[PDB]
Amino acid sequence: LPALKLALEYIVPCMNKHGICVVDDFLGKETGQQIGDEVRALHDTGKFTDGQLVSQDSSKDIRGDKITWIEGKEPGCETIGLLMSSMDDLIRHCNGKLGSYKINERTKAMVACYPGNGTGYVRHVDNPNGDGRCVTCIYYLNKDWDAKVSGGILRIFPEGKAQFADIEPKFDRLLFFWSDRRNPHEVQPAYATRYAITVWYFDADERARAKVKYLGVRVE
Ligand SMILES: O=C(O)CNC(=O)c1nc(Cl)c2ccccc2c1O
Ligand SMILES: [Mn+2]
């Protein structure tokens, strides 16, 4: 599907209505599997961190999600860069229709690997203090994921709503949601290796004034 039809007929109305939007089969099996291959290659060659220290004898320490930051131009990351370009194309075609936000900037990609040792990620808000991030975009890479046996569901707790939104981390699934306090969320314990790629998109105004908050030119 062209970035434009998805954006205009699904992503814009869904984000303005629900603030949580899922696109399945975003890039297709061939491209999705190549991205999976690149991510697994990064993992197998030690490009990830050792993992979030979950509990602290140091040999018995439990570590959780591993991460690596990817620009998309690195050797062996070109298909990740293609994913990032595709995300950018969608956001570009949503211009002026997501909230009243103006998006002209993003982060690098954060590739995350939950190692499958029963660790997850605690309930949190991505941007609770106004750092400029307005949309969280996550792409999942896990073929034939069965949450009934592997866990790893993303559970979102939409504000003002007495309800859960449970999202399985399915292969070739793209997810968008508002990054601020509207969408507290958690990753339930994962019992199999679980990969995802996240990009955050900035609202230009919030980012500009965030620079005032968290602050140079020489004076002679
Ligand atoms: O992977 C998922 O479905 C959802 N993950 C997250 O919400 C998530 N959020 C943050 Cl802020 C971090 C932050 C650092 C490392 C991993 C994260 C993560 O997986
Ligand atoms: Mn998060």
Residue numbers in the entry: 188 to 243, 246 to 404, 409 to 413
Sentences from the paper on this structure:
The ferrous iron and 2-oxoglutarate (2OG)-dependent HIF prolyl hydroxylases (PHDs/EGLNs) catalyse trans-4-prolyl hydroxylations on HIFα subunits, thus promoting their binding to the von Hippel–Lindau protein (VHL), a targeting component of a ubiquitin E3 ligase, and signalling for HIFα degradation under normoxic conditions. The PHD-catalysed hydroxylations of HIF-1α/HIF-2α in higher animals occur in amino- and carboxy-terminal oxygen-dependent degradation domains (NODD and CODD). The three human PHDs exhibit different NODD/CODD selectivities, with PHD3 being substantially more selective for CODD than PHD1/2 (refs 16). Biophysical analyses employing crystallography and NMR reveal that the molecular basis of PHD isoform and variant selectivity involves enzyme–substrate interactions involving β2/β3 loop residues (that bind the LXXLAP motif) and helices α3 and α4, regions which display sequence variations between the PHD isoforms.
Using biochemical and structural studies, we identified four more residues in α3 and α3-βI loop regions (PHD2/Ile280, Arg281, Ile292 and Gly294 that are substituted in PHD3/Val102, Leu103, Val114 and Glu116, respectively) and which play roles in determining selectivity. Indeed, we found that FG2216 (IOX3)35, used in clinical trials for treatment of anaemia, preferentially displaces NODD over CODD from PHD2.
